Design an enzyme around this catalytic site. Structure first.
Site, short mmCIF file in Angstrom:
data_model
loop_
_atom_site.label_atom_id
_atom_site.label_comp_id
_atom_site.label_asym_id
_atom_site.label_seq_id
_atom_site.Cartn_x
_atom_site.Cartn_y
_atom_site.Cartn_z
N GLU A 1 0.90 -1.25 -0.10
CA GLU A 1 -0.02 0.01 0.04
C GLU A 1 0.91 1.14 0.01
OE1 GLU A 1 -2.76 -0.39 3.36
OE2 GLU A 1 -3.76 -2.18 2.36
N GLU B 1 -5.71 -8.13 -1.11
CA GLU B 1 -5.94 -7.98 0.35
C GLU B 1 -7.31 -7.47 0.55
OE1 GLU B 1 -3.08 -6.01 3.19
OE2 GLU B 1 -4.78 -5.47 4.12
O1 GIF Z 1 -7.61 -2.55 7.19
C1 GIF Z 1 -6.68 -2.81 7.78
C2 GIF Z 1 -5.44 -3.26 7.04
C3 GIF Z 1 -5.07 -2.58 5.71
N1 GIF Z 1 -3.95 -2.89 4.76
C4 GIF Z 1 -2.94 -3.26 5.65
C5 GIF Z 1 -3.08 -3.82 6.86
O2 GIF Z 1 -1.96 -4.02 7.62
C6 GIF Z 1 -4.20 -3.61 7.82
O3 GIF Z 1 -3.78 -2.14 8.01
#
Ligand code: GIF
Ligand SMILES: *[C@@H]1O[C@H](CO)[C@@H](O[C@@H]2O[C@H](CO)[C@@H](O)[C@H](O)[C@H]2NC(C)=O)[C@H](O)[C@H]1NC(C)=O
Ligand SMILES: *[C@@H]1O[C@H](CO)[C@@H](O[C@@H]2O[C@H](CO)[C@@H](O)[C@H](O)[C@H]2NC(C)=O)[C@H](O)[C@H]1NC(C)=O
Ligand SMILES: *[C@@H]1O[C@H](CO)[C@@H](O[C@@H]2O[C@H](CO)[C@@H](O)[C@H](O)[C@H]2NC(C)=O)[C@H](O)[C@H]1NC(C)=O
Ligand code: NAG
Ligand code: CA
Ligand code: NI
Ligand code: NI
Length: 641
Positions: A158, A234
């Protein structure tokens, strides 16, 4: 309405598998110290084929020593010239997964990086070859020390990608004989990676999979145009109640239907972190009490089963999938060997809300679905039936076998709301079961650890959840009274993913603790400027770690102490002088009751009846003033909630 299922004029896209994420951050933290047989049962529910979730894919964080949502995870390279492939628990988890399912797909992805990679800057793209070296060493170590074949490598979770880095990563991989390893990018949004692939021919060649996060079941045009595999790399991240199960059920179907995504990976694998940490209980199941042994086989486990037990990577979607007239959806897959699996969901809006994104109201009502099988699906006579009702709930119960004796090759179901049906020619389905785990107890109100373990199985003491910095078992062969200690081993701020605190810290215990006495032996390794602390009533952690308040008892090697209300040290409860220097063991005691607290040094009152904010609650904690070496021993806590 009638829905035709047929393979006459071809098939859909190749199914790539359903998975989950261990990491981002320290989500599997509390699982490792579960007593047997419970620890092994939990892993069976997750990874044993034809049992529970039966996951096809396991994705883990490549720890970079930074805070990455619910804690930090240790890197294989704390420092330059440092190599260690036995830190943390992702190695262990991957091996446990492979033992149960040898065909499981393994993925690794960095959230954060060790600071030394940045060469002065907080940026992983200063030296592309160096960062690539770091990542590839992780893959080699996985194979050489653990016999693990990593199938997919990501870029930077991200966070922005660098096109030249991705290309250098591919060259580095091939150079080390890792051509079989595939690259997924960029684990963020559909853009700019999608358009980048269309504009850059060389970049297109080195990227195998486009992986997007929380896409809301949809993709974008450029991603379709790329002709790449599209994954929801994810998703989920919702509390594992019936509602989260509904979310999981719906997106598992509609990610392919609406967005051509042939894989969906949930965050996270199992909620094995303190529930009061960010996104508590957002795993496929729950295991946040290693001290009691209590774990919950939550409903997303059985939602997963509806697909995983009856599909495998290498299967193919039929061209004939879609939505139901009165709401809900259906997908259908074949293996090319005459098998057929049908997955139907009718999740109501109110009972399938994901946190990201939240859908506008849609309506689901009673309906009849008639499925007709054309093409090579004609000579199917019998279908096993599996059923789940979320809400007064029942899970993964096998129903009476369905028969297609009349040559019409058709059947009809009545579908209510919040239901799942799996119809398959597979006879291997099983709702796995173990004797129910112990009841849930709070964290022990009396706790102690002397860290006296000569050959630890893991790199850190149990129940200590690092929220900034990294704490490890440490052996000092020359000192006898402190031969085995706990050591904070980071000496510079990592290339951070989250907003790490400026001080290191590890939390432990019960967040609901109000009155408590914390005691620990501390050792400051840095002369003049070094400092450490112990704490109680620490109310926040994870990505919120800089927000943490409580009562913090600091001592510094310059001969002083501080009592603060916050980890950042902005709010003072008390301060003054103390006979404290570096490289000398001290015993700190911190007592907190109601509106008042006291501090002890080597069993002697340093400060007393100091007024603190009340009411107030939180964990116990230890830590260092900055990213600096320090040691801890003989930790004790007595508390009440
Ligand atoms: O909704 C939370 C997730 C978002 N994407 C990364 C994860 O580590 C976690 O923070
Ligand atoms: C991606 O999936 C979509 C469906 O969400 C495909 O678009 C069409 O979808 C309609 C139903 O809305 C079908 O009747 C069409 O058959 C689909 N198009 C085609 C050409 O078959 C789209 O084709 C898919 N894109 C891919 C696989 O690249
Ligand atoms: C459905 O899938 C099963 C499971 O893969 C197939 O059964 C296998 O068939 C292969 C040969 O194609 C054998 O080598 C395996 O030993 C079989 N395994 C099991 C568990 O039976 C089956 O052929 C497929 N088709 C049907 C109609 O069942
Ligand atoms: C933590 O300590 C505080 C301070 O003594 C407790 O609050 C007192 O509790 C007693 C017994 O219930 C009452 O008689 C007092 O009136 C309370 N005083 C205040 C200022 O609240 C509190 O109950 C303790 N909490 C736990 C969980 O042990
Ligand atoms: C949902 O659909 C049914 C039938 O299509 C209709 O009777 C019902 O009133 C609808 N409800 C809402 C809240 O839109
Ligand atoms: Ca010790
Ligand atoms: Ni090697
Ligand atoms: Ni709270």
């Amino acid at each position: 309405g009638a829905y035709v299922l047929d393979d006459s004029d071809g098939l859909g896209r190749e199914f790539d598998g359903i998975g989950a994420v261990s990491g981002g951050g320290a989500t599997s933290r509390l699982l490792v110290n579960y007593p047997e047989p419970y620890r092994s049962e939990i892993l069976d529910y997750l990874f044993k084929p034809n049992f529970g979730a039966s996951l096809h894919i396991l994705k883990v964080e490549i720890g970079g020593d930074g805070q990455t949502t619910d804690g930090t995870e240790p890197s294989h390279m704390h420092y330059e010239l440092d190599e260690n492939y036995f830190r943390g628990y992702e190695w262990w988890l991957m091996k446990e997964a492979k033992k149960r399912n040898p065909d499981i797909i393994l993925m690794g992805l960095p959230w954060s990086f060790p600071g030394w990679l940045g060469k002065g800057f907080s940026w992983p793209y200063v030296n592309l070859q160096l960062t690539a070296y770091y990542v590839v060493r992780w893959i080699l170590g996985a194979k050489h020390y653990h016999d693990l074949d990593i199938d997919y490598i990501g870029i930077w979770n991200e966070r922005p990608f660098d096109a030249n880095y991705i290309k250098e990563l591919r060259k580095m991989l091939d150079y080390q004989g890792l051509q079989r390893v595939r690259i997924i990018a960029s684990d963020n949004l559909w853009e700019p990676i999608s358009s980048s692939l269309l504009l850059d021919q060389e970049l297109w060649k080195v990227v195998d999979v486009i992986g997007a996060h929380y896409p809301g079941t949809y993709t974008v045009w450029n991603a379709k145009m790329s002709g790449k595999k599209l994954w929801s790399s994810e998703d989920f991240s919702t509390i594992n109640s019936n509602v989260g199960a509904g979310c999981w059920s719906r997106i598992l179907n509609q990610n392919y239907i609406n967005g051509n995504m042939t894989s969906t990976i949930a965050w996270n694998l199992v909620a094995s972190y303190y529930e009061e940490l960010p996104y508590g209980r957002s795993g496929l199941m729950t295991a946040q009490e290693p001290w009691s042994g209590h774990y919950v086989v939550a409903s997303p486990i059985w939602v997963s089963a509806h697909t995983t037990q009856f599909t495998q990577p290498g299967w193919y979607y039929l061209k004939t999938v879609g939505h139901l007239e009165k709401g809900g959806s259906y997908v259908a897959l074949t293996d090319g060997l005459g098998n057929l699996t049908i997955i139907i969901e009718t999740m109501s809006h109110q009972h399938s809300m994901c946190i990201r994104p939240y859908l506008p109201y849609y309506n689901v009502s009673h309906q009849l679905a008639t499925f007709t099988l054309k093409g090579s699906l004609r000579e199917i006579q019998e279908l096993q039936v599996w059923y789940t009702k979320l809400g007064q709930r029942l899970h993964f119960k096998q129903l009476d076998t369905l028969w297609l004796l009349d040559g019409s090759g058709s059947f009809t179901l009545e579908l209510e709301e919040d239901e799942i049906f799996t119809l398959t020619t597979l006879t291997t389905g099983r709702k796995g079961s173990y004797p129910p785990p112990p009841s849930s107890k709070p964290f022990p109100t009396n706790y102690k650890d002397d860290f006296n373990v000569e050959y630890p199985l893991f790199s850190e003491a149990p129940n200590f959840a690092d929220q900034t910095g990294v704490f490890e078992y440490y052996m000092n062969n020359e000192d006898r009274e402190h031969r085995f200690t706990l050591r904070q081993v980071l000496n510079q701020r990592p290339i951070t993913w989250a907003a790490d605190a400026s001080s290191t810290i590890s939390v432990i215990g019960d967040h609901h603790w109000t009155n408590m006495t914390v005691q620990c032996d501390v050792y400051i390794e840095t002369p003049r400027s070094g400092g450490v602390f112990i704490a109680g009533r620490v109310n926040k952690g994870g990505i919120l770690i800089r927000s943490a308040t409580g009562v913090f008892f600091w001592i510094f090697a310059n001969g002083s102490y501080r009592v603060t209300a916050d980890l950042g040290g902005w709010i003072t409860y008390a301060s003054g002088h103390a006979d404290v220097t570096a490289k000398r063991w001290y015993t700190l005691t911190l007592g907190i009751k109601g509106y008042f607290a006291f501090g002890m040094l080597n069993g002697t009152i340093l400060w007393k009846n100091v007024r603190v904010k009340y009411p107030g609650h939180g964990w116990a904690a230890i830590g260092t003033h900055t990213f600096e070496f320090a040691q801890f021993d003989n930790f004790r806590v007595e508390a009440a909630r």
